Structure formats: C-alpha cells, structure tokens
Design a protein around this motif. Sequence first.
Motif, PDB file in Angstrom:
ATOM      1  N   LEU A  63       0.867  -1.238  -0.101  1.00  0.00           N
ATOM      2  CA  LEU A  63       0.047   0.078   0.021  1.00  0.00           C
ATOM      3  C   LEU A  63       0.796   1.340  -0.014  1.00  0.00           C
ATOM      4  O   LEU A  63       0.650   2.214  -0.958  1.00  0.00           O
ATOM      5  CB  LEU A  63      -0.714  -0.001   1.246  1.00  0.00           C
ATOM      6  N   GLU A  64       1.947   1.072   0.991  1.00  0.00           N
ATOM      7  CA  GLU A  64       2.732   2.309   0.816  1.00  0.00           C
ATOM      8  C   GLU A  64       3.694   2.657  -0.209  1.00  0.00           C
ATOM      9  O   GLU A  64       4.313   3.695  -0.390  1.00  0.00           O
ATOM     10  CB  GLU A  64       3.578   2.299   2.260  1.00  0.00           C
ATOM     11  N   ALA A  65       3.906   1.595  -0.872  1.00  0.00           N
ATOM     12  CA  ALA A  65       4.450   1.855  -2.225  1.00  0.00           C
ATOM     13  C   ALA A  65       3.311   2.054  -3.299  1.00  0.00           C
ATOM     14  O   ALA A  65       3.984   2.010  -4.569  1.00  0.00           O
ATOM     15  CB  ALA A  65       5.128   0.282  -2.662  1.00  0.00           C
ATOM     16  N   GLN A  66       2.338   2.633  -3.188  1.00  0.00           N
ATOM     17  CA  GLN A  66       1.239   2.649  -3.715  1.00  0.00           C
ATOM     18  C   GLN A  66       1.025   1.718  -5.077  1.00  0.00           C
ATOM     19  O   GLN A  66       0.909   1.954  -6.173  1.00  0.00           O
ATOM     20  CB  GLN A  66       1.521   4.098  -4.641  1.00  0.00           C
ATOM     21  N   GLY A  67       1.016   0.385  -4.698  1.00  0.00           N
ATOM     22  CA  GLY A  67       0.701  -0.701  -5.444  1.00  0.00           C
ATOM     23  C   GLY A  67      -0.478  -1.153  -5.603  1.00  0.00           C
ATOM     24  O   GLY A  67      -0.669  -2.158  -6.134  1.00  0.00           O
ATOM     25  N   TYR A  68      -1.367  -0.686  -4.926  1.00  0.00           N
ATOM     26  CA  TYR A  68      -2.726  -1.043  -5.152  1.00  0.00           C
ATOM     27  C   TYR A  68      -3.462   0.073  -6.115  1.00  0.00           C
ATOM     28  O   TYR A  68      -3.616   1.473  -6.022  1.00  0.00           O
ATOM     29  CB  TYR A  68      -3.534  -1.005  -3.968  1.00  0.00           C
ATOM     30  N   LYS A  69      -3.602  -0.295  -7.481  1.00  0.00           N
ATOM     31  CA  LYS A  69      -4.105   0.740  -8.447  1.00  0.00           C
ATOM     32  C   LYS A  69      -5.621   0.987  -8.492  1.00  0.00           C
ATOM     33  O   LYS A  69      -6.057   1.893  -8.880  1.00  0.00           O
ATOM     34  CB  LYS A  69      -3.731   0.039  -9.794  1.00  0.00           C
ATOM     35  N   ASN A  70      -6.435  -0.124  -7.755  1.00  0.00           N
ATOM     36  CA  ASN A  70      -7.884   0.227  -7.664  1.00  0.00           C
ATOM     37  C   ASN A  70      -8.156  -0.695  -6.572  1.00  0.00           C
ATOM     38  O   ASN A  70      -7.307  -1.371  -6.028  1.00  0.00           O
ATOM     39  CB  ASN A  70      -8.694  -0.317  -8.731  1.00  0.00           C
ATOM     40  N   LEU A  71      -9.413  -0.600  -6.104  1.00  0.00           N
ATOM     41  CA  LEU A  71      -9.995  -1.232  -4.831  1.00  0.00           C
ATOM     42  C   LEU A  71      -9.841  -2.893  -4.893  1.00  0.00           C
ATOM     43  O   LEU A  71      -9.653  -3.608  -3.903  1.00  0.00           O
ATOM     44  CB  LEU A  71     -11.391  -0.733  -4.490  1.00  0.00           C
ATOM     45  N   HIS A  72     -10.458  -3.128  -6.158  1.00  0.00           N
ATOM     46  CA  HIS A  72     -10.332  -4.373  -6.519  1.00  0.00           C
ATOM     47  C   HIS A  72      -9.095  -5.186  -6.186  1.00  0.00           C
ATOM     48  O   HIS A  72      -9.212  -6.504  -5.491  1.00  0.00           O
ATOM     49  CB  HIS A  72     -10.809  -4.808  -7.811  1.00  0.00           C
ATOM     50  N   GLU A  73      -8.045  -4.560  -6.724  1.00  0.00           N
ATOM     51  CA  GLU A  73      -6.541  -5.234  -6.209  1.00  0.00           C
ATOM     52  C   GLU A  73      -6.365  -5.363  -4.628  1.00  0.00           C
ATOM     53  O   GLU A  73      -5.898  -6.291  -4.153  1.00  0.00           O
ATOM     54  CB  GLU A  73      -5.477  -4.434  -6.716  1.00  0.00           C
ATOM     55  N   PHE A  74      -6.864  -4.392  -3.851  1.00  0.00           N
ATOM     56  CA  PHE A  74      -6.883  -4.513  -2.005  1.00  0.00           C
ATOM     57  C   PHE A  74      -7.548  -5.449  -1.825  1.00  0.00           C
ATOM     58  O   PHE A  74      -7.447  -6.103  -0.900  1.00  0.00           O
ATOM     59  CB  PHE A  74      -6.938  -2.941  -1.958  1.00  0.00           C
ATOM     60  N   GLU A  75      -8.776  -5.578  -2.211  1.00  0.00           N
ATOM     61  CA  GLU A  75      -9.847  -6.580  -1.896  1.00  0.00           C
ATOM     62  C   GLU A  75      -9.529  -7.722  -2.171  1.00  0.00           C
ATOM     63  O   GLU A  75      -9.662  -8.918  -1.378  1.00  0.00           O
ATOM     64  CB  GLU A  75     -11.160  -6.214  -2.563  1.00  0.00           C
ATOM     65  N   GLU A  76      -8.809  -8.213  -3.373  1.00  0.00           N
ATOM     66  CA  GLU A  76      -8.241  -9.382  -3.714  1.00  0.00           C
ATOM     67  C   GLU A  76      -7.090 -10.074  -2.384  1.00  0.00           C
ATOM     68  O   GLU A  76      -7.064 -11.068  -2.319  1.00  0.00           O
ATOM     69  CB  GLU A  76      -7.555  -9.622  -5.040  1.00  0.00           C
ATOM     70  N   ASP A  77      -6.484  -9.100  -2.019  1.00  0.00           N
ATOM     71  CA  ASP A  77      -5.359  -9.239  -1.036  1.00  0.00           C
ATOM     72  C   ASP A  77      -5.826  -9.676   0.425  1.00  0.00           C
ATOM     73  O   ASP A  77      -5.670 -10.594   0.963  1.00  0.00           O
ATOM     74  CB  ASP A  77      -4.201  -8.275  -0.805  1.00  0.00           C
ATOM     75  N   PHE A  78      -7.161  -8.908   0.676  1.00  0.00           N
ATOM     76  CA  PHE A  78      -7.770  -9.012   1.864  1.00  0.00           C
ATOM     77  C   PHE A  78      -8.763 -10.416   1.887  1.00  0.00           C
ATOM     78  O   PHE A  78      -8.224 -11.336   2.713  1.00  0.00           O
ATOM     79  CB  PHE A  78      -8.759  -7.913   2.015  1.00  0.00           C
ATOM     80  N   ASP A  79      -9.105 -10.813   0.714  1.00  0.00           N
ATOM     81  CA  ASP A  79      -9.776 -12.018   0.604  1.00  0.00           C
ATOM     82  C   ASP A  79      -8.658 -13.133   0.628  1.00  0.00           C
ATOM     83  O   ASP A  79      -9.087 -14.199   1.289  1.00  0.00           O
ATOM     84  CB  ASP A  79     -10.315 -12.251  -0.884  1.00  0.00           C
ATOM     85  N   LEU A  80      -7.480 -13.052   0.101  1.00  0.00           N
ATOM     86  CA  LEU A  80      -6.409 -13.882   0.385  1.00  0.00           C
ATOM     87  C   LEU A  80      -6.283 -14.413   1.862  1.00  0.00           C
ATOM     88  O   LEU A  80      -5.917 -15.379   2.402  1.00  0.00           O
ATOM     89  CB  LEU A  80      -5.061 -13.680  -0.275  1.00  0.00           C
ATOM     90  N   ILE A  81      -6.064 -13.477   2.599  1.00  0.00           N
ATOM     91  CA  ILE A  81      -5.868 -13.615   3.987  1.00  0.00           C
ATOM     92  C   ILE A  81      -6.965 -14.242   4.703  1.00  0.00           C
ATOM     93  O   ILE A  81      -6.751 -15.481   5.247  1.00  0.00           O
ATOM     94  CB  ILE A  81      -5.940 -12.259   4.852  1.00  0.00           C
ATOM     95  N   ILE A  82      -8.104 -13.989   4.476  1.00  0.00           N
ATOM     96  CA  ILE A  82      -9.353 -14.951   4.736  1.00  0.00           C
ATOM     97  C   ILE A  82      -9.267 -16.336   4.336  1.00  0.00           C
ATOM     98  O   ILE A  82      -9.515 -17.428   5.046  1.00  0.00           O
ATOM     99  CB  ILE A  82     -10.406 -14.092   4.620  1.00  0.00           C
ATOM    100  N   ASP A  83      -9.193 -16.624   2.876  1.00  0.00           N
ATOM    101  CA  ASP A  83      -9.396 -17.636   2.332  1.00  0.00           C
ATOM    102  C   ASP A  83      -8.181 -18.407   2.708  1.00  0.00           C
ATOM    103  O   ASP A  83      -8.608 -20.028   2.636  1.00  0.00           O
ATOM    104  CB  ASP A  83      -9.666 -17.635   0.665  1.00  0.00           C
TER     105      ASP A  83
END
Length: 123
Positions: A63-83
């Motif tokens: 995130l601090e490298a500004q590596g999320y280009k849209n919310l979907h990319e961010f959600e994909e990583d959050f979903d990985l934590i859970i799944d």
Amino acid sequence: SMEQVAMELRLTELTRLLRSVLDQLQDKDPARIFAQPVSLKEVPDYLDHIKHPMDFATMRKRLEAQGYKNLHEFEEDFDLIIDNCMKYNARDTVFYRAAVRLRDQGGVVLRQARREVDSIGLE
C-alpha cells in the motif's frame, strides 16, 4: 505532464482511502492472528498448502509503495488472508473462526469503501 501529476494525485488519494480501510479492517483482528506472514519456521509445510500467502503487514508494504491501483486489487489481497486461513485451518479452530469474523465484519467497511471510491471517482 500535468496529466501524469493529476493521475498520481488520484493514486495518492486512493492510497489515503485504502490506508484508512486497512486500519479499519485490521481493528477487526484484535487477536492479531493476521498481522504477520505465517512463519515458515513454525509452519514449515505452509507453502505446500497455500500458494499465495498474505497478511496485513505485507498489504501495508504494498500500500505504501502505492501498489494498489484500484480497490479490487486491495480486496483480492484481503480475501487471500481470509481464504488461505479457512483452507489451512479446520472449522473448529480459533484461526478459522477469526477469519470468519474478520470476513463478516470487514464486509461492512468494504461496502462503503466501494461507494466512496466510485462517488469520489478515485480509480
């Protein structure tokens, strides 16, 4: 160009919004079960099970490298934590149960984040 600067301001804005979302999601993990990568020292077979590990610290780095280009990319990583957690750990574990609770409580935060990203038009 001015256009490049505008686009970077937008991404900086998105980063600011996602930083706030990440802080709110992490608050739903008071046990800090998802704070750090699963230790390959304490769980040496982990990568045989889970092909794309994720955790909140790794997300924060991106995130601090500004590596999320849209919310979907961010959600994909959050979903990985859970799944990842709900596959590696059985239903009757404190780990699986923590992931369910994070999923359920985070859904609310992510619902409003999606509205805000759209209305403010940050992506």
